[PDB]
Design a protein around this ligand. Structure first.
Ligand SMILES: [Mg+2]
Ligand SMILES: [Zn+2]
Ligand SMILES: [Zn+2]
Lengths: 156, 746, 169, 171, 167, 332, 46
RNA sequence: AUAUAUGCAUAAAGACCAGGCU
């Protein structure tokens, strides 16, 4: 009850939804773009604008308040930024799973090697749980090694 | 950086300073609503607003950081915009008093002359260095436009009554007031009083005199609320002299105003988009409430153990007198009491140490009590040994720290018998009898000067001819046998605008002054050539600021200066003679105002020469006189050439407003006490600062931020909360009912 | 009384949440409390506190006790609660937690209280019993050839808190 | 403009008011805190209907605080501005930079750019007015406008209107 | 502060463009859509109140509040004084002063006749029973809802509005 | 003029009681000023007035306050002259009252002087802007008496009856209003400090009495200085004459003592008694009305038939100059 | 100044407040930094 | 017109390594 009063209603978390952050969402939630390698300007405080310690990111000291939320370090939860990459980079935690996807879809038309015509694939589709459904699809589609031209839209 | 005399009241009274609710500006896309006047003021309702117009026109004549406007039409438009913003921020609903500093009295004349001389000198040095740099980079190949070569720096000495610029400013202010009254639906019930530079007086003095004249009417409402806008901090002590609790001061913000120094490159070649951004940069403002200050001083000054009943009004008067004694423009500060406001910190405690023993108050309705101030100064002299020891110890400790980390003066005040050596250092006289006589005369003149200063802000100007004939002041123990001294004043007559123009303007800033008197500064055969030397000595007295040093100058001789001035009235034209006269205030009244039909009937219909007001709808009081030059069938045009995109001003017909000559009520001996029927504001101090200002409980805990945002409401604490003059207390019937109703409920 | 003298208080919480420190408040002798305020008083007698020894193998290793303020710097324990805590007095260190709300005080008093934990659900048998010297003592006390004179009987009867005041034949 | 809406409010009741008259106290809180307010999603709230016997439901005891939370569902009448909707109004202030008009509690501002060139402001008129050939708009005169913008500050709604279309003007 | 029955509408991968409000395109936003939900969650049509209907419902609500508070006892000032709170009182007097002067049908018999006559987007009937209409051209010029209906018959309905209802 | 500083300073009210001056009851109760002002209004009017009963304020105050606050006996003489009514205190009753008052110990005179001292201390002889500092700080060093006074004569009406009421006015708010003098008038009274229910009841009774006193002259505002048993001004507060009945009835501590408001019935009784006097006395008649302890149910009125008693009552009631001026007016 | 805004969803009204451990806040921020989006919803979609 | 600023009365190192305690 020591927090300052807020007009927003207070409740409790009832559901937690997990997922991946899309690049559009990452750009939207960000408040500043980080592009300058340097930290200080000429070593007289006043950190670099757009650097790793931009004042818009947040406030960690009572001398300067946050430039985005306007509160001190006791209330500001911190604000995220975005950094654009020149080339795409793999995710180390997603190295194997992507490869598994590479064994499921075609590398030219981006289509699955098997369709609903196959009976085993048809049964594997009806699995409600995504994890075991994906496991079954990968196990069934890793055996075939050629994209079928016929149609299913395959490139042959 | 916050200045002194204001940082101290931030430290000691942090709770009176409040921020301002600026505006709302644009809400919908494209153009938006202009925030019409009739909406309630979020800062609290305000009736009377008194504007110190000189403090509005001077910084928006030469901004320090904002790039300098060119020409003078843009200057007038900028003044119009700033005044409109200030009025919309304060939102007065009864009276706007536009007061411009007129002909100053003789007491301030020496300071005025020093300030004008320094302004001319450093402006000349600055433009000489600027031209040298222009030539230097011309040798480097830089291109300079004609708007920068021929156009020199604007002379700040032009802010002086009698110059054509003041006439243009007065005409522009009259036109702007008439236009605002005739086009704004929210200004229908407002009377605008203009007291331009033609009217003798000085700004805040005119405001104080008007408030005093208002208080002299028995029908005056004591619940009216006043506000003063001004850059001078002394107004903080001026409002407490009015003894009107519903009082406040609007000031430019100092804490949050991160003033960044800008060079000429940040003025000349910076872009027009940034020009508009700086124009639209909402400068924060501070509300400084004086009722909260009175609440603080009611508890602070309530020292126990007194042989006489405690009166908060006389204590307020004594506190204001001490504050004026510590520092004022008319008299130089004492040698002992120095480092500005810390002196105020000292004497008050001295007063607290001497009040129980003394039987009488220091001042009574602006009149000094000689024995009381004499014993106060005697105790100050007794402590002068410790004060001099402390300040010289601070100086020597600064010298030691500097050593560790890295007219001839040489007085050495730490040695005994420093008074005589200081006397021959400042006077070059070794005769003990002459030194004693000079010291006695200086003491008598300084007593007369503090009396003059205290009467000036309390009972009007007592003498327009008095002036301090020295450059320094004696120490406290020189003030002995003060009851024997006699003080007398002669009212005299205020000087003509041309006389003050002669007195304060230098020889290097005579372009604005008419060519008739130019030979009185330029010709070497002139009999008054000696009052304007090219260079003058400066006595530092020990400091580092250039202009804070003593400006050693030949004192003006009044008699022959007068003779020279009156020897050359026959060469002036009709307009120059009309600019060399003193007139009365101007009252401007709307067509839809309730007082308009009555004034028209009593002036332009009944043929009467004068009409008496007393209390009216707008709360003014005085005498209205028909003004001959005002033709009702004419058209009032803007005296300023219109620039691009500055809110095009149409031509105002004279049938839509009335302009009359205004006089105040006859002068009377004003008392220092609250009127009957006053409704106190809602109590704002709650059992924390009340004992913090008394004991050491959370008083020295330094919170070095002092941001005014900690209150952020300042709304219910403005108007006269309640409907009873006397608050419930002890065993009154209504109080009894209230307290037992509360007890039954809880 | 102040924070330096027991019993006393440390802080005074206003209705709006402002805190007054009694250490720096030297004029606390003439302060009045308002209804709805909170006073952070010292730990008094009969205050339920959680009391724990690590590692906590089972629920009996963390129980609610009643505070008795005593001199010296060691926690005092009954000898019968050492076995559920699996503790001895050769240098053991134990922890104490103070609830800060009425609901959690009631929860500790009605759920985690020591008397409610005498019988454990692991083997439907008690986990606290008469141990160490007392046990040996009763073996030397209830022997057939043990006889007590009148004065010692009166002293022992008075030593019983739950004695009914009737001397048996 | 006037719409009928279904609203729900969460009300917190202190334990000090846990008495037999708590239903009436909750009703009084609802009456105080609904009418006269404005919201971004719903607009200005005009008033509530059938509030004498509204169902307050059962309270929710907040753990650790002891206050009771009530979810009150009710039927109310509200007022919300619309883009492009024409409406009749009575004007209040007339200025060269524009003039205001009142539609219920809402103030709609019409800028000078949005008046046809036939109407001309004149300060000499009593009261000051926009006049034209057989056209007169003083203070307090009935006018027709079309909303061309709305913006919300949670507490209030601000709108701008235009009279630059056919069959729009004073009536 | 207050909430309605319609909610949820969490974030989706693809954003929606048709979000801004415009009465010319007959778009009212998610809050005031064609179908709303009652206490039990059943689908119901949007309820639009015309100025005469709004006047009747406000008078009924104020008289019900007077019955609840005073207990069985006419003027706009009295109805404004029925409620409490400075903001609420100001809002209610402002809306009553706006509504009484611009109410086309101020009597209950004409209100009942309009009910019947009215007996189609509710915004259309609200705007027809809200603002004065005398000609087909001005009716379609003021708001384009009547311009494109494909079953217009504005002649007969406007003749009814001018003669059967209050001219 | 009285700021909060005077209240905070605990101004004593019993100081100077040794040299307090008293006025004669007969001289102060005479109708000389009212009859005189009648003489000027008659001279500069030229025709007889429309008033019916001519009297002081205190007589009607007591006669209206009687039904509910009746701890004082009164006998009054009524003279019907030229169609007008003159009401005065009975001269034998005046001397009996003086005799019984001469032995009233010292507490009652102490309270009376405390009230007069509060009146002297709370007011100024001139408006505040025209007053000096000597005339403000010397209020406590002045002389207090009841002879020195200022009064107003006001025409009031009730039912179909016109009354010319003379009454003393303590002071005015800030200035004299020529448009409506009665709007700025103000009355000052002193009561003991309130500390319990008995004090509440006593103060409500005093409030009803002084409201009856003040409402006759139409004075809107009243001021009350509450003092302790040491005659020290403890507090001060304001009241409005029109607002007294509503706040008295709607008292949170005692919301329902009585379903019958005393004020409305007091007005009704005043109307009944004034019409009773209107059509109970004929022309050229002298009557005596009375109320004492023994009745407690009714007021007694009798007609005097003694020639000597009637002549002496007329002589002691109406001065010779008024009679001769009336005769001159009748002749002219 | 009582201003709540969400840049991504252009929201200013449907915003709630929660009381959570600071370690939970740090964990959620780190998960966001690792391209994982844990969304806290106060209502059950069902 | 003010007047310069020449001033600041609490900030919280954390991460690893080694040796012991029950
Ligand atoms: Mg062990
Ligand atoms: Zn932040
Ligand atoms: Zn393929």
């Amino acid at each position: 009850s020591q927090f300052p009063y807020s007009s927003a209603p207070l409740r409790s978390v009832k559901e937690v939804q997990f997922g991946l952050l899309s690049p559009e969402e990452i750009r939207a939630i960000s408040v500043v773009k980080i592009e300058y390698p340097e930290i200080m300007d000429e070593s007289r405080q006043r950190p670099r604008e757009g650097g790793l310690n931009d004042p818009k990111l947040g406030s960690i000291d009572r001398n300067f308040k946050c430039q985005t939320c306007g509160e001190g370090m006791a209330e500001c939860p911190g604000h995220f930024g975005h950094m654009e990459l020149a080339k795409p980079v793999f995710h180390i935690g997603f190295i194997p799973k992507i490869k598994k996807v590479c064994e499921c879809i075609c590398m030219n038309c981006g289509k699955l090697l098997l369709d609903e015509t196959n009976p085993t694939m048809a049964q594997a589709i009806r699995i409600r749980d995504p994890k075991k459904r994906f496991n079954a699809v990968w196990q069934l589609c890793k055996t075939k090694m050629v994209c079928e031209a016929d149609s299913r839209g395959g490139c042959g | 950086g916050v200045p002194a005399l204001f940082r101290w009241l931030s430290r000691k009274y942090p709770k009176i300073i409040s921020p301002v609710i600026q505006d709302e500006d644009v809400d919908i896309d494209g153009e938006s609503r202009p925030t019409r006047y009739e909406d309630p003021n979020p800062n609290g309702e305000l009736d009377n607003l008194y504007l110190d117009m000189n403090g509005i026109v001077h910084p928006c004549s030469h901004p320090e950081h904002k790039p300098v406007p060119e020409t003078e039409d843009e200057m007038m438009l900028d003044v119009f915009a700033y005044t409109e913003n200030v009025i919309m921020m304060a939102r007065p609903r009864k009276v706007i008093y536009i007061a411009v500093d007129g002909v100053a009295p003789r007491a301030k004349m020496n300071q005025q002359r020093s300030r004008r001389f320094r302004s001319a000198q450093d402006a000349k040095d600055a433009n000489e260095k600027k031209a040298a740099e222009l030539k230097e980079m011309e040798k480097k190949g830089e291109i300079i436009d004609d708007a920068i070569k021929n156009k020199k720096t604007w002379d700040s000495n032009a802010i002086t009554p009698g110059t054509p610029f003041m006439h243009r400013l007065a005409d522009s202010l009259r036109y702007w007031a008439a236009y605002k009254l005739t086009t704004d639906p929210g200004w229908s019930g407002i009377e605008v009083i203009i007291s331009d530079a033609s009217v003798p007086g000085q700004g805040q003095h005119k405001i104080m005199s008007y408030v005093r004249s208002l208080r002299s009417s028995p029908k005056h409402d004591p619940n009216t609320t006043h506000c003063i806008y001004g850059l001078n901090a002394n107004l903080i002590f001026l409002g407490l002299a009015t003894h009107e609790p519903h009082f406040k001061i609007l000031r430019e913000d100092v804490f949050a105003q991160d003033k960044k120094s800008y060079s000429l490159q940040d003025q000349l070649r910076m872009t027009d988009i940034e020009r508009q951004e700086l124009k639209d940069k909402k400068t924060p403002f501070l509300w400084l409430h004086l009722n909260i200050l009175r609440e603080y001083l009611q508890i602070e000054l309530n020292v126990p153990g007194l042989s006489f009943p405690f009166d908060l009004e006389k204590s307020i008067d004594d506190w204001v007198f001490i504050c004026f004694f510590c520092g004022n423009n008319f008299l130089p500060h004492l040698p002992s009491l120095d480092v500005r406001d810390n002196s105020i910190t000292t004497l008050v405690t001295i007063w607290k140490q001497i009040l129980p023993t003394m039987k009488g108050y220091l001042t009574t309705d602006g009149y000094l009590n000689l024995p009381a101030v004499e014993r106060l100064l005697a105790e100050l002299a007794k402590k002068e040994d410790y004060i001099f020891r402390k300040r010289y110890e601070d100086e020597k400790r600064s010298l030691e720290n500097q050593k560790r980390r890295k007219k001839n003066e040489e007085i050495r005040l730490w040695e005994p018998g420093y008074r005589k050596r200081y006397y021959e250092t400042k006077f070059h006289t070794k005769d003990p009898q002459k030194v004693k006589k000079i010291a006695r005369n200086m003491v008598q003149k300084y007593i007369e000067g503090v009396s003059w200063v205290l009467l000036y802000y309390y009972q009007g100007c007592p003498s327009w001819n008095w002036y301090y004939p020295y450059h320094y002041a004696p120490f406290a123990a020189d003030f002995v046998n003060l009851s024997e001294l006699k003080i007398e004043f002669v009212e005299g007559t205020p000087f003509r605008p041309y006389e003050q123009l002669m007195s304060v303007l230098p020889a290097a800033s005579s372009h604005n002054l008419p060519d008739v008197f130019r030979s009185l500064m330029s010709d070497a055969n002139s009999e008054i050539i000696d009052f304007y030397p090219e260079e003058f000595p400066l006595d530092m007295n020990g400091k580092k600021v250039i202009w804070q040093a003593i400006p050693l100058l030949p004192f003006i001789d009044e008699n022959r200066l007068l003779k020279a001035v009156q020897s050359k009235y026959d060469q002036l034209t009709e307009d120059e003679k009309f600019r060399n006269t003193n007139r009365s205030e101007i009252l401007v009244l709307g067509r839809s105002h309730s007082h308009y039909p009555t004034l028209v009937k009593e002036l332009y219909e009944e043929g009467k020469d004068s009409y008496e007001f007393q209390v009216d709808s707008s709360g003014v009081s005085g005498v209205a006189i028909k003004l001959q030059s005002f033709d009702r069938s004419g058209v009032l045009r803007l005296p300023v050439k219109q620039l691009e995109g500055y809110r095009h001003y149409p031509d105002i017909s004279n049938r839509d407003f009335l302009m009359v000559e205004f006089k105040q009520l006859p002068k009377s001996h004003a008392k220092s006490m609250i009127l009957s029927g006053l409704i106190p504001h809602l109590r704002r101090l709650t059992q924390e600062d009340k004992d913090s200002i008394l004991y050491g409980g959370t008083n020295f805990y330094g919170r070095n931020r002092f941001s005014p945002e900690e209150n952020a409401d300042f709304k219910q604490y403005i108007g006269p909360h309640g409907k009873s003059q006397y608050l419930p207390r002890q065993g009154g019937y209504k109080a009894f009912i209230q307290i037992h109703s509360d007890e039954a409920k809880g | 009384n102040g924070p330096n003298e027991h019993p006393g208080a440390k802080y005074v919480i206003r209705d709006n949440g402002d805190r007054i420190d009694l250490r720096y408040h030297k004029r606390a002798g003439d302060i009045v409390l308002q209804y709805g305020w909170k006073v952070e008083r010292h730990l008094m007698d009969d205050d339920p506190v959680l009391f724990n020894r690590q590692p906590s193998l089972h629920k009996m290793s963390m129980m609610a006790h009643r505070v008795k303020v005593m001199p010296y710097s060691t926690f005092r324990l009954n000898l019968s609660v050492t076995s559920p805590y699996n503790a001895d007095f050769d240098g053991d260190e134990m922890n104490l937690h103070v609830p800060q709300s009425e609901e959690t005080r009631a929860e500790l008093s009605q759920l985690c209280a020591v008397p409610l934990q005498i019988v454990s659900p692991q083997s439907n048998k008690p986990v606290m019993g008469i141990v160490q010297d007392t046990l040996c003592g009763v073996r030397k006390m209830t022997l057939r050839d043990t006889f007590i004179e009148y004065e010692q009987v009166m002293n022992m009867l008075f030593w019983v808190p739950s004695w009914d005041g009737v001397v048996p034949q | 403009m006037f719409f009928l809406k279904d609203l729900s409010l969460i009300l917190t009741l202190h334990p000090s008011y846990f008495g037999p008259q708590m239903n009436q106290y909750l009703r009084e809180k609802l009456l105080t805190d609904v009418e006269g307010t404005c919201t971004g999603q719903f607009g200005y709230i005009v008033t509530v209907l059938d509030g004498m016997n509204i169902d307050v439901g059962k309270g929710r005891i907040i753990p650790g605080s002891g206050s009771a939370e009530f979810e009150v569902k009710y039927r109310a009448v509200v007022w919300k501005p619309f883009k492009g909707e024409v409406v009749d109004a009575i004007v209040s202030n007339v200025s060269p930079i524009g003039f205001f008009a009142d539609v219920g509690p809402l103030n709609v501002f019409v800028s000078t750019r949005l008046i046809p060139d036939n109407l001309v402001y004149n300060p000499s008129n009593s009261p000051p007015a926009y006049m034209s050939n057989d056209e007169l708009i003083t203070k307090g005169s009935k006018v027709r406008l079309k909303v061309v913008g709305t913006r919300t500050d949670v507490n209030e709604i601000y709108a701008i209107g235009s009279i630059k279309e056919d069959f729009l003007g004073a009536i | 502060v207050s909430t309605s029955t319609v909610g949820a509408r969490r974030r989706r991968a693809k954003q929606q463009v048709d979000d801004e409000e415009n009465a010319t395109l007959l778009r009212l936003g998610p809050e005031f859509a064609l179908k709303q939900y009652d206490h039990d969650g059943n689908e119901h049509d949007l309820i639009a109140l015309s100025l005469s209907e709004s006047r009747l419902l406000i008078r009924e609500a104020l008289k019900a509040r007077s019955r609840a508070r005073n207990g069985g006892v006419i003027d706009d000032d009295e109805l404004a004084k029925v409620t409490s709170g400075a903001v609420a009182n100001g809002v209610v007097k402002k809306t009553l002063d706006y509504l009484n002067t611009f109410a086309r049908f101020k009597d209950e018999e004409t209100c009942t006749a309009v009910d019947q006559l009215l007996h189609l987007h509710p915004f259309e009937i609200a705007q027809l029973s809200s603002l004065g209409c005398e000609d087909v051209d001005e009716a379609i010029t003021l708001i384009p809802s009547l311009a494109a209906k494909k079953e217009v018959n504005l002649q007969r309905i406007l003749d009814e509005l001018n003669r059967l209802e209050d001219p | 003029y009285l700021p909060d500083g005077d209240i905070d300073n605990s101004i004593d009210l019993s100081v100077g009681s040794k040299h307090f001056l008293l006025g004669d009851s007969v001289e102060l109760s005479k109708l000389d000023p009212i009859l005189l002002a009648l003489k000027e209004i008659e001279k500069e009017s030229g025709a007889k007035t429309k008033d019916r009963i001519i009297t002081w304020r205190g007589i009607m105050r007591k006669l209206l306050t009687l039904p509910y606050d009746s701890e004082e006996d009164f006998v009054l003489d009524v003279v019907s002259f030229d169609g007008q009514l003159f009401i005065q205190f009975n001269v034998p009753y005046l001397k009996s009252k003086d005799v019984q008052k001469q032995g009233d110990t010292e507490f009652h005179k102490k309270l009376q002087f405390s009230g007069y001292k509060f009146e002297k201390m709370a007011t100024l002889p001139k408006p505040w802007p025209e007053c000096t500092r000597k005339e403000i700080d010397s209020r406590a060093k002045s002389k207090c008496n009841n002879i020195e006074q200022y009064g107003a004569i006001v025409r009031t009406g009730i039912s179909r009856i016109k009354i010319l009421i003379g009454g003393a006015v303590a002071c005015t708010a800030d200035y004299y209003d020529e448009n409506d003098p009665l709007s700025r008038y103000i009355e000052l009274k002193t009561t003991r400090t309130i500390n319990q229910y008995k004090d509440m009841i006593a103060f409500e009774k005093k409030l009803f009495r002084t409201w009856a006193q003040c409402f006759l002259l139409g004075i809107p505002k009243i001021i009350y200085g509450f003092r302790d048993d040491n005659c020290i001004l403890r507090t001060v507060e304001e009241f409005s004459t029109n607002d007294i009945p509503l706040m008295v009835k709607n008292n949170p501590l005692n919301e329902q003592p009585k379903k019958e408001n005393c004020y409305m019935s007091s007005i009704n009784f005043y109307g009944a008694v004034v019409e009773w006097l209107n059509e109970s006395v004929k022309d050229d008649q002298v009557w005596k009305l009375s109320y004492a302890k023994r009745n407690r149910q009714y007021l007694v009125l009798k007609e005097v038939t003694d020639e000597n008693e009637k002549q002496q009552i007329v002589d002691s009631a109406i001065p010779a100059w008024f009679k001769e001026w009336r005769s001159e007016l009748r002749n002219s | 100044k009582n201003q709540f805004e969400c840049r991504s969803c252009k929201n200013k009204t449907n915003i709630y407040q929660l009381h959570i451990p600071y370690a939970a806040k740090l964990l959620f921020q780190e998960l966001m930094a690792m391209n994982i989006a844990p969304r806290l919803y106060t209502e059950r979609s069902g």
